[PDB]
Amino acid sequence: THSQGYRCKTRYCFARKFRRHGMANLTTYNRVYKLGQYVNIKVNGAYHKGMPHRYYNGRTGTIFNIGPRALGVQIQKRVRGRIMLKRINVRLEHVHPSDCRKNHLERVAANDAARRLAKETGQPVPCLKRQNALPRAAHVVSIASAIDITPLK
Amino acid sequence: WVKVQKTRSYFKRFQVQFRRRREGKTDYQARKALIIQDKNKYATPRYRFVVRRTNKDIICQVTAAELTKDRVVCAAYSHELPRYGIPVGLTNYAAAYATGLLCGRRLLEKLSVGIKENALAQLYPGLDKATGEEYHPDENENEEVHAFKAFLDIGLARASTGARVFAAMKGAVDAGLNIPHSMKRFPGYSKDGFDSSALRDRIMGKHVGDYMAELKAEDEETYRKRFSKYIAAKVEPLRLEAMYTKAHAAIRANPQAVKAKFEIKKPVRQARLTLKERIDAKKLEALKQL
Amino acid sequence: ENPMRRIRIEKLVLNICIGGEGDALTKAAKVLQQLTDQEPTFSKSRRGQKISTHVTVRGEKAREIIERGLRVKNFELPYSCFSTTGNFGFGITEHIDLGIKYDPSMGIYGMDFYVVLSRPGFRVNKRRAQQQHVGASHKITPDEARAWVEREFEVVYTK
Amino acid sequence: RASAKDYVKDALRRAKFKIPGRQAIVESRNWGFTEFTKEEYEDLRERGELQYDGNNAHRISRKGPLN
RNA sequence: AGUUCGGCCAUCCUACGGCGGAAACUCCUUAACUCGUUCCGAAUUAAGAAGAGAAGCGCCGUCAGGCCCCGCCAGUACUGCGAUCGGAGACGUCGUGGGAACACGGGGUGCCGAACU
RNA sequence: CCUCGCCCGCCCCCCAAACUCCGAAGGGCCGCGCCGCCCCGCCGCUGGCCUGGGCGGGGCGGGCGAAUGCGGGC
RNA sequence: GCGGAACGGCGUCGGCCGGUCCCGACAGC
RNA sequence: GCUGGGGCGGCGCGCCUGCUACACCGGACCGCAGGCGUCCCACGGCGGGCUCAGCGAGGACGGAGACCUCCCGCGGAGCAGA
Ligand SMILES: [K+]
Ligand SMILES: [Mg+2]
Ligand SMILES: [Mg+2]
Ligand SMILES: [Mg+2]
């Protein structure tokens, strides 16, 4: 039919991975979260309390509440021609920290370090801006070529 | 004609357990319950009092769980006891009490190494003498400084009435550690309170002395063969609580650890060689032989 | 050989399987308790009706019981009654032949004798912590068991 | 074998008229129903490297235990 | 080198042969006490120190099964965008982008951390 | 004692909208400027502690760190 | 130069793969 | 009332699982295979201990199956009803 129970159409997204059944490792409980941190949502099918809805599987958001046992996560959801901010409570088995800012943090650190380095020696500051791949430059190649031909059918 | 049970498909789909579970060392349910903390308490260390018992001695440790490992901040063993006045009878009830007391005193002294005012050692001085009664350090805890708190972890042992794990925990509590617990699993417990006399008797090895006396009294051959190490060192039933009290006083006086000396020995049993060219030779010869 | 490789009787299990609850079960359990000096236990059919009782005996008392039971059969047992794990058993028909004093009122009852052989160090497969399997060389094979039994209770076998 | 190879194609042409659509008749370069071309099959037979079954043939094994 | 407590959870598992113990771990001995087994000191609890590498454990081996990496499979199968391109249709083709799987061949077979001996 | 069957092993033809050990093209969500150092204050929360977390203040150094287009919001 | 299929054509043009042939093939030893 | 005219028949008229559905979410039909309007003071809470189905081998009034024992057993059992 068409019924829309809380867990409809979850035959594949809530199943365990191959040879990864059973209890979760203990790193999922003793890692530290702070307000404003970016996290990912991935549902674990062996834990049935604090489970988010199928819609939130594979989204990223920020922490707005640190609780005794659950976290509060803010997520942007599009509804028709508008975006709504949804706040949900998730238990620890369904949340992982997100590396969506690691590249920017490393870029900032490197930019500052390079700026410090050349100043002490006085060397000119290089360009600290990313470049989209530019066209190739002039160069010279050697020839030991192999003749290529088309085969018969 | 008999079907094969462990087939190739059996191996393809097999999932191994965690390594420490395969060796039967840790119960991961209990550990998860023990090391869980409120998320709004962030990276604040949480300590458990770990007690283990081998065939020859007793181990006491205070450890904190980290992200990628476990951190030990104090450990006491039953080897050290002869260094304090107890040469024999290790791994029995009195020895467990003594090792727990040693661990507690050593941890408190290490914590108060430098501090001068309100040091954790001056405040919360353990019970002056072992009386075998219910004592709780947190009763009337100092407001400015609270007592060190740990949680007891038993492992795979059976938590029965009269077990030595609880003896080690009682010894640790007598040194000034705040370990939550009741008095149900101690030898003096009844439906209405409990009597410190039985606990005191056990803590001082009265049962061992009585057994030694009765055995030597009438059946002396079995006594000689069954208490060879006791008899060799000249330990007699009547002069037993005195030695235990002297050991308690000595431990409570200077409870620090002196490093023992030794050198490691690596045999050849693990020195056998790992024989591609050499492996490839043992097939050509066998093929030619056949 | 190493002294740790020698065999001993590990346990002996006495079974009487006569269907239906009643003084038959009660009388059989009473006789089992009297013989073994150990209370028996009942087994429930798979439903919920008692059908049998049994008791396990360890130590030397098992050795004496087995000695008498073999005496019943004249130290003769088929060579093929040894299991692939190194165990064996037989079955008397009345308990009076064991040397027990007959009772007109108690009745008669057939019995099952199963005895398990073992070596020192089999504990590794039974303890609660660090449980493992015993090595293939330490296990008792049927031929070693037959040799030990024949050399122990003076038994001859018939093919 | 070579006896009935003179009429196999006519049998196939006869069967072609009961099937809808368009079909083609081909002669395989393989040996019978095996996966070996005739040249490869004959070579591997003159080199002693064929385990034989009631219909099919397979190359000798080079993995697993000996004996 | 060993043990206690851990992290990641097979390159660590499974089967079968072999090597080793000074210390350690283990196997071992006893049932007065403590506690214990639908019955059993088997398990478990308490108390020991005459034996032992025979197991468990550490290491080695196997044209080993499994697990892991690289190549080939193959620019193949499939596919996004554009086409008054072919064809009655079923389907195919061209231009411009992305790109497998099985099978098969070669090789490999636990590290990391804190405390004690 | 023979001769085919059921059973065990290998090999092999052909399959699945309600089979999947594997798995694209294609889609979806998030990020792409402020940073670093030092010191100070408050908490009735949190910790064995001189621990944390949160919210503020004061000094020092540095700086605008992909392309393309274009004013936005209620 | 009808909308159009299985299936036929010794109509014409163009190919691919095999034999025999001045040691005389094919069609009329 | 819906409705490949209406009637007769049926009830996608309140809910639930899998598929249809074309790898975020959404997605139609009187589309496909089905279910619900109940049952349980224990079939509920917590703690401890234990390991299931079954293959193989053995015990025999005892057999294709009762009960007993050892071995190996990644779940092939069980967890009220789809
Ligand atoms: K209509
Ligand atoms: Mg527990
Ligand atoms: Mg109407
Ligand atoms: Mg509606």
GROMACS .gro file of C-alpha atoms in nm, chain A residues 6-152:
model
  147
    6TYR     CA    1   0.797   0.624   1.123
    7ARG     CA    2   1.036   0.366   0.974
    8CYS     CA    3   0.898   0.309   0.624
    9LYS     CA    4   1.141   0.238   0.338
   10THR     CA    5   1.436   0.158   0.566
   11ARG     CA    6   1.515  -0.198   0.453
   12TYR     CA    7   1.865  -0.103   0.334
   13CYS     CA    8   1.963   0.221   0.506
   14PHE     CA    9   1.918   0.087   0.861
   15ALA     CA   10   2.078  -0.255   0.813
   16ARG     CA   11   2.426  -0.323   0.947
   17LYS     CA   12   2.726  -0.331   0.716
   18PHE     CA   13   2.879  -0.661   0.609
   19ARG     CA   14   3.070  -0.822   0.898
   20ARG     CA   15   3.015  -0.515   1.118
   21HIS     CA   16   2.732  -0.631   1.344
   22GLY     CA   17   2.714  -0.618   1.722
   23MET     CA   18   2.807  -0.357   1.977
   24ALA     CA   19   2.986  -0.034   1.890
   25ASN     CA   20   3.342   0.037   1.991
   26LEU     CA   21   3.393   0.247   2.300
   27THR     CA   22   3.546   0.543   2.116
   28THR     CA   23   3.190   0.651   2.035
   29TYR     CA   24   3.132   0.734   2.403
   30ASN     CA   25   3.456   0.894   2.525
   31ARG     CA   26   3.514   1.157   2.256
   32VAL     CA   27   3.447   1.519   2.348
   33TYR     CA   28   3.194   1.752   2.185
   34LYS     CA   29   3.156   2.128   2.227
   35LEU     CA   30   2.893   2.386   2.140
   36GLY     CA   31   2.916   2.505   1.780
   37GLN     CA   32   3.091   2.194   1.648
   38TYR     CA   33   3.001   2.040   1.312
   39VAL     CA   34   2.886   1.677   1.316
   40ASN     CA   35   2.751   1.416   1.075
   41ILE     CA   36   2.438   1.205   1.122
   42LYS     CA   37   2.458   0.833   1.046
   43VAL     CA   38   2.190   0.601   1.184
   44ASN     CA   39   2.304   0.287   1.365
   45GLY     CA   40   2.044   0.013   1.333
   46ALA     CA   41   2.138  -0.173   1.651
   47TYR     CA   42   2.035   0.117   1.879
   48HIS     CA   43   1.667   0.204   1.896
   49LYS     CA   44   1.657   0.495   2.144
   50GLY     CA   45   1.736   0.848   2.031
   51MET     CA   46   1.715   0.735   1.667
   52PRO     CA   47   1.655   1.015   1.414
   53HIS     CA   48   1.418   0.992   1.120
   54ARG     CA   49   1.540   0.855   0.786
   55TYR     CA   50   1.544   1.206   0.639
   56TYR     CA   51   1.835   1.316   0.859
   57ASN     CA   52   2.064   1.028   0.759
   58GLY     CA   53   2.361   1.179   0.577
   59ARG     CA   54   2.322   1.545   0.676
   60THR     CA   55   2.560   1.781   0.855
   61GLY     CA   56   2.476   2.032   1.125
   62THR     CA   57   2.605   2.213   1.434
   63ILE     CA   58   2.569   2.145   1.806
   64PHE     CA   59   2.337   2.379   1.995
   65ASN     CA   60   2.285   2.173   2.312
   66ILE     CA   61   2.506   1.940   2.516
   67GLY     CA   62   2.295   1.714   2.734
   68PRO     CA   63   2.358   1.442   2.993
   69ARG     CA   64   2.308   1.165   2.736
   70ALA     CA   65   2.201   1.324   2.406
   71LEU     CA   66   2.313   1.610   2.183
   72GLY     CA   67   2.104   1.881   2.021
   73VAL     CA   68   2.177   1.930   1.651
   74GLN     CA   69   2.054   2.208   1.421
   75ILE     CA   70   1.984   2.111   1.060
   76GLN     CA   71   1.861   2.308   0.760
   77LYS     CA   72   1.572   2.143   0.577
   78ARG     CA   73   1.411   2.262   0.254
   79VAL     CA   74   1.030   2.259   0.250
   80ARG     CA   75   0.877   2.377  -0.080
   81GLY     CA   76   1.034   2.717  -0.155
   82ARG     CA   77   1.178   2.777   0.190
   83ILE     CA   78   1.441   2.657   0.438
   84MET     CA   79   1.347   2.558   0.793
   85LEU     CA   80   1.583   2.518   1.087
   86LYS     CA   81   1.510   2.188   1.263
   87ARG     CA   82   1.645   2.101   1.608
   88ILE     CA   83   1.660   1.732   1.700
   89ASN     CA   84   1.793   1.528   1.991
   90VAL     CA   85   2.030   1.244   1.903
   91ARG     CA   86   2.200   0.979   2.113
   92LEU     CA   87   2.573   0.922   2.078
   93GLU     CA   88   2.558   0.607   1.865
   94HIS     CA   89   2.419   0.802   1.567
   95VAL     CA   90   2.657   1.101   1.551
   96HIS     CA   91   3.018   1.147   1.436
   97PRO     CA   92   3.240   1.455   1.424
   98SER     CA   93   3.269   1.619   1.084
   99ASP     CA   94   3.580   1.719   0.889
  100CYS     CA   95   3.410   1.977   0.667
  101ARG     CA   96   3.636   2.256   0.801
  102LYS     CA   97   3.971   2.075   0.830
  103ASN     CA   98   4.097   2.199   0.493
  104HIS     CA   99   4.015   2.560   0.581
  105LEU     CA  100   4.180   2.533   0.923
  106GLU     CA  101   4.498   2.388   0.773
  107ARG     CA  102   4.500   2.660   0.506
  108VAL     CA  103   4.472   2.932   0.770
  109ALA     CA  104   4.752   2.779   0.976
  110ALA     CA  105   4.981   2.747   0.673
  111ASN     CA  106   4.907   3.101   0.556
  112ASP     CA  107   4.998   3.241   0.897
  113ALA     CA  108   5.314   3.029   0.920
  114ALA     CA  109   5.440   3.128   0.575
  115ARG     CA  110   5.362   3.493   0.647
  116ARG     CA  111   5.571   3.470   0.964
  117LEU     CA  112   5.860   3.290   0.796
  118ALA     CA  113   5.934   3.528   0.509
  119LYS     CA  114   5.898   3.835   0.732
  120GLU     CA  115   6.186   3.732   0.960
  121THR     CA  116   6.412   3.670   0.659
  122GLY     CA  117   6.252   3.952   0.458
  123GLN     CA  118   6.189   3.729   0.156
  124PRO     CA  119   5.893   3.829  -0.064
  125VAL     CA  120   5.558   3.680   0.034
  126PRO     CA  121   5.435   3.425  -0.222
  127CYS     CA  122   5.075   3.407  -0.341
  128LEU     CA  123   4.855   3.262  -0.065
  129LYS     CA  124   4.548   3.218  -0.289
  130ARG     CA  125   4.431   2.890  -0.433
  131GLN     CA  126   4.447   2.873  -0.812
  132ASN     CA  127   4.218   2.675  -1.036
  133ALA     CA  128   4.430   2.459  -1.266
  134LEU     CA  129   4.594   2.684  -1.525
  135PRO     CA  130   4.685   2.580  -1.880
  136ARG     CA  131   5.020   2.409  -1.927
  137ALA     CA  132   5.341   2.595  -2.011
  138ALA     CA  133   5.595   2.558  -2.290
  139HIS     CA  134   5.841   2.269  -2.276
  140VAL     CA  135   6.050   2.037  -2.493
  141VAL     CA  136   6.008   1.660  -2.531
  142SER     CA  137   6.225   1.388  -2.683
  143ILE     CA  138   6.119   1.150  -2.959
  144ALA     CA  139   6.158   0.771  -2.945
  145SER     CA  140   5.807   0.726  -3.074
  146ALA     CA  141   5.615   0.411  -3.164
  147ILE     CA  142   5.397   0.410  -3.475
  148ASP     CA  143   5.031   0.345  -3.394
  149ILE     CA  144   4.785   0.189  -3.638
  150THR     CA  145   4.422   0.073  -3.654
  151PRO     CA  146   4.349  -0.302  -3.633
  152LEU     CA  147   4.130  -0.518  -3.853
   0.00000   0.00000   0.00000
